Symmetry: D2
Subunit: 314 residues, 4 copies
């Protein structure tokens, strides 16, 4: 089950969807007219819409009075203490990949299916074009759409628990330090190696084309159960990225004979510091992120590779 109503690779609703969360790219200019159009349309079939509190306080949305008549029907949440985990049937994302990551931040448990929309530039996780969006949204609502069960990593930080869920990767690297970083990595309680360099890009398949790909990791389809381990410019000619089964335990610590501390980041945010007495535990989460695909998983993955990463051009 994914959300209060949606469940499952096709998508089934059982109960008709009535609550939708639209997530905007925060400070942007080209995403005002499409956001207004989408919100106006989504409430023409009497369907509850949710909007971040920080979006309605924007000066460029309160100034317009034509949209203000229909804006009052927003089930606003302030994100300070509101748990919208059990209140959303499916999500529409506007702006790019960074929006989808934020969509995974708000749902640390089961997450409803998402429908990412790309409006400008190119997105690897955003397959839907905003043109003719009415028909696509209607088809998604009816229940004729395929999804991919994108894996996520459950990460726990023990300081001498924080319980984060990450989508692309968790990065353990160096911050202001300009020297080598020595980090010990354990798999199932056994020391497998010590990385001596900028850091590691332990990731998910859907993060294989992310920052992991920049460091030399291979392209991994999101339909395989696997966990990547990829360095960041290691000071060793023979440390290639490795792929491990999804059902294993990963642990990451600072080696006892190490100078400087380490810095851990989750999808580019929540950048905190780990010292000698801290530990990071990584597993494969039981709550995947279903993202609706326009036609099918493999074709969308390969077209994203072709357009975004220019994989095998000429």
């Amino acid at each position: 089950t994914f959300g209060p109503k949606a469940t499952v690779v096709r998508l089934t609703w059982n109960k008709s969807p009535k609550s939708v969360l639209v997530i905007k790219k925060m400070r942007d200019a080209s995403l005002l007219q499409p956001f207004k159009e989408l919100c106006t349309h989504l409430m023409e079939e009497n369907m509850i819409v949710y909007v971040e509190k920080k979006v309605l306080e924007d000066p460029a949305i309160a100034s317009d009075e034509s949209f203000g008549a229909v804006k009052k029907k927003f089930t606003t949440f302030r994100e300070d203490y509101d748990d919208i985990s059990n209140q959303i049937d499916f999500i529409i994302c506007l702006g790019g990949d960074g929006t989808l990551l934020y969509a995974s931040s708000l749902f640390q448990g089961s997450v409803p299916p998402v429908m990412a929309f790309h409006l400008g530039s190119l997105g690897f996780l955003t397959p839907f074009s905003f043109e003719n969006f009415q028909s696509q949204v209607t088809q998604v609502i009816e229940g004729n759409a395929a999804v991919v069960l994108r894996s996520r990593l459950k990460v726990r930080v023990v300081k001498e628990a924080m319980q984060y869920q990450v989508l692309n990767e968790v990065v353990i690297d160096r911050g202001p330090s300009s020297y080598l970083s020595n980090v010990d990595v354990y798999l199932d309680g056994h020391l497998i190696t010590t990385v001596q360099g900028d850091g590691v890009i332990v990731s998910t398949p859907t993060g294989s084309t992310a920052y992991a790909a920049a460091a030399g990791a291979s392209m991994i389809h999101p339909n395989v159960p696997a966990i990547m381990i990829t360095p960041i410019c290691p000071h060793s000619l023979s440390f290639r990225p490795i792929v491990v089964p999804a059902g294993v335990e990963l642990k990451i610590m600072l080696s006892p004979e190490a100078r400087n501390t380490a810095w851990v980041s989750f999808d580019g945010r929540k950048r905190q510091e780990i010292r000698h007495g801290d530990s990071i535990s990584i597993t494969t989460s039981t709550y995947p992120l279903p993202s609706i695909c326009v036609r099918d998983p493999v074709s969308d993955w390969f077209e994203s590779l072709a357009q975004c990463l220019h994989w095998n051009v000429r």
Copy 2:
């Protein structure tokens, strides 16, 4: 798995073991005789390829000939080994185990690989104190790794091969670039221009695929690999695809020269414009017995053979 054969359960006590020896070798004779004499003091039937018994260096010794007469002989010509062997012991190195996969095109009994000197990624058992190890495996206290294999069909205008490490399409005598098209689920995913591609198993991730820049994949990860051989494109990163897909490699219509297909570094065939290669994930894996557990053996192989992250 076999007639009677993640832990290993025997159900029926093993009695028919096949010992595969590395041909054209001299350091393996004494361990081969020792292992064969030991395996036939528990009244357990052993199998040896016919070409091994006709070796001049093994017929010249009459001490081994007394126990040699109890061998069960197959010649690979018409005496194809079948669901009659429930335990395999391999001597010599990695290429021996590959041969073990060549002999069994269907379900394969569990295999024991011995590294008699040198180093082998797929050979984790040291020959020292082999009596206790073989006894423990015969009893039924041993973990196994189900290595996946690729089912390959060659259609010429069927061959039905099973491969362990990879299938390599490349160029032979040709010195020009090679253009071959690849289909995934009946869809043009790419055309590769260069030497070729090394579509492989996780077991082949550390093989010739690793030579071309492919990543390291544990044999417990259910996926198929696609890595090039020096492509004339900076962007063609090796890719990993689900095990349930079907790959179809052909020659592009606007392609000069023919292509050459090799299965686990073995018999090479030539494919022309009208030929196709279909690759899927086989339903008959290769159970390889591990000394202690899969992960530690894999990482020891990485550290000892490939020198993965030394110093």
Copy 3:
């Protein structure tokens, strides 16, 4: 000096050029009309034009009688029989990169400047577009053009055969399906033994060639260097290396090696090297002058952007 008259980076003619060599891409169809146009234009300034004998015996070169009056004024030469050597002031190439390689094959010593043309192919070493070729060829004839002196490798095979290679010389394994073990000496010292498909020891101008496919870095043709890059080694550490151009390389088969090896010179005639054979590689004293449209750096980076799509988006 580069040829009988051309000399030197700007090109100085000293004596007015009168002998020109046009090299065609052999079996092709889209190149006949540009070849005919260039040949007709070249002899309206009273330029002696040299053409390969096999080109003039093509079926679609005498079937047209309009061009018949032109073929009578070609100084025909034949491969392996007549050595053109020091008789050509500068060369014009048509068809693509390989033609330039063939241009290096005909001149084992000093070679005249080459004005490469790309026709229906993009090409890394072919920077001239055939459009408005009259002004370009006139400007080159006058003597206002920049030149990139591409280094070449001098290779001797001892079994006393000598070759000059432009892109690289490749020592690899052919019909063998097993690993190839070959030993490399630098200045008489064992620096490495490689266990894999082979090595792509190359010139800078061959860096973007088959060397690049194997993971080599992009090497500008104005740096004096010799590359050594492998072909899929069975080792994660054997990163490609760059050595000074003034060194001696000597490649052999290791004593404990199975099978023989195969040596190829610029993707051409392949020889077999056994245990008793040796390959000696140095930097030649006869570079290949290649005329450039604007200047070496911008042309190199444009070739990287168009051909190899270096850093797109």
Copy 4:
């Protein structure tokens, strides 16, 4: 000329060396005994020695009164005075030496104590004979190229670096967007962590960690290597030593960038700042044990394990 007296690839002194500078790897307890032994030996041929002031300030250097008498003959300092340099500690010491000599650099005899090291080929065992042979003038050197870097702020600041210059991101977690120009021509913009524009000596450094090839220090070139670029086709490149590189921030760039010289003091560059990199005319001569190429391959074999088994 390299220093007041040393000149040149063989090394010729012309005038007998008399002033030598010893550089110690800061606080390293393993180097105290070699430092004392070397300083005692160097002042038995009546040869002037130079030491950093902070080395004598070490609490565990005046406690031993045996070395105090030897200590009192140090020409301590807190150019044009040092004939050649002896380095103890490892690779990072040599870089520090290049920091002290922004102009002509005297030859350096690097020693590896407690570390293996790439640029430190001399073993401390039997150091008497090695130092004597160096003093006599029977030794070969390699002329390691350096990069001259000028930072222009919209305040000129010159620098000479030995390994590389790194233009990366600091605390920022987003991609860094920086434009690079060669001879006034925009060659590319890089979309990632940064660039590792380097020397051949730095080819085995942090540049090698990002996928750059090894270049022998006798090959004149300037390397450009990314740091995990967000592109599959940005292969590292080399350029002739005679070119001029100019790195800036693109006009449509978020966040700033940080420039680091050999792993030292980090500066911040805004949109109005520029970095100009050329090949310096003052190389760093480092004396070799036997010959350049064999020492380079020895360092590749035991430091980076290049092509093992």
